[PDB]
């Protein structure tokens, strides 16, 4: 096999959270912001080569919502079994003091797709420049997600990615500090 493009959608209750996205070889091509009802391209430069009309996704999510209701009942109401995430914190490249870098918090192998992630700088939460991806599908039907923190390497501070998921007894803080 050479490539695989994957159109993945989900609808979750009682959250009533839905998702529509495309995936090329593990990477998100784009996803539809359900609230703003708009197509968001993973790399800006992707939208200069293709077009996607967001209203379609919105329709798809509706059938999904519907089908979920049918299935939940069909299953004698069997709820989803939480599977807590594996968390890893790394950087974009080899850290060099006073060399802008990026801390990546990789959350993997979890379900359902609901997680709360905080970046803490010397224990205090950081929001400057942060970003994250939507829930990326996995062949086992669990999800993946990435959070990013642009930062300036230093020996003066420690870092933690704080992850909260229903399958975790307590919030998981993964640490990173410059050696």
């Amino acid at each position: 096999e050479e490539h695989v493009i994957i159109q993945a959608e989900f609808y979750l209750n009682p959250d009533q959270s839905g998702e529509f996205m495309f995936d090329f070889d593990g990477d998100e091509i784009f996803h539809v912001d359900m609230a703003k009802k708009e197509t968001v391209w993973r790399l800006e430069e992707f939208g200069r080569f293709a077009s996607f009309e967001a209203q379609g996704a919105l329709a798809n999510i509706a059938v999904d919502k519907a089908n979920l209701e049918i299935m939940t009942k069909r299953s004698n109401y069997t709820p989803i079994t939480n599977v807590p995430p594996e968390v890893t914190v790394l950087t974009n490249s080899p850290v060099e003091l006073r060399e802008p870098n990026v801390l990546i918090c990789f959350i993997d192998k979890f379900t359902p797709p609901v997680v709360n992630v905080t970046w803490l700088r010397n224990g205090k939460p950081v929001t400057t420049g942060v970003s994250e991806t939507v829930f990326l599908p996995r062949e086992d039907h669990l999800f993946r997600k990435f959070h990013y923190l642009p930062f300036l390497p230093s020996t003066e501070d420690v870092y933690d990615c704080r992850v909260e998921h229903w399958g975790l007894d307590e919030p998981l803080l993964k640490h990173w500090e410059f050696d």
Binding site: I6, E9, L12, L68, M71, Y77, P112, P137
Partner: peptide, 12 residues
């Protein structure tokens, strides 16, 4: 929680 997913995979 109850979850539903639908996936269309194009393998080339």
């Amino acid at each position: 929680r109850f979850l539903w997913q639908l996936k269309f995979e194009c393998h080339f």
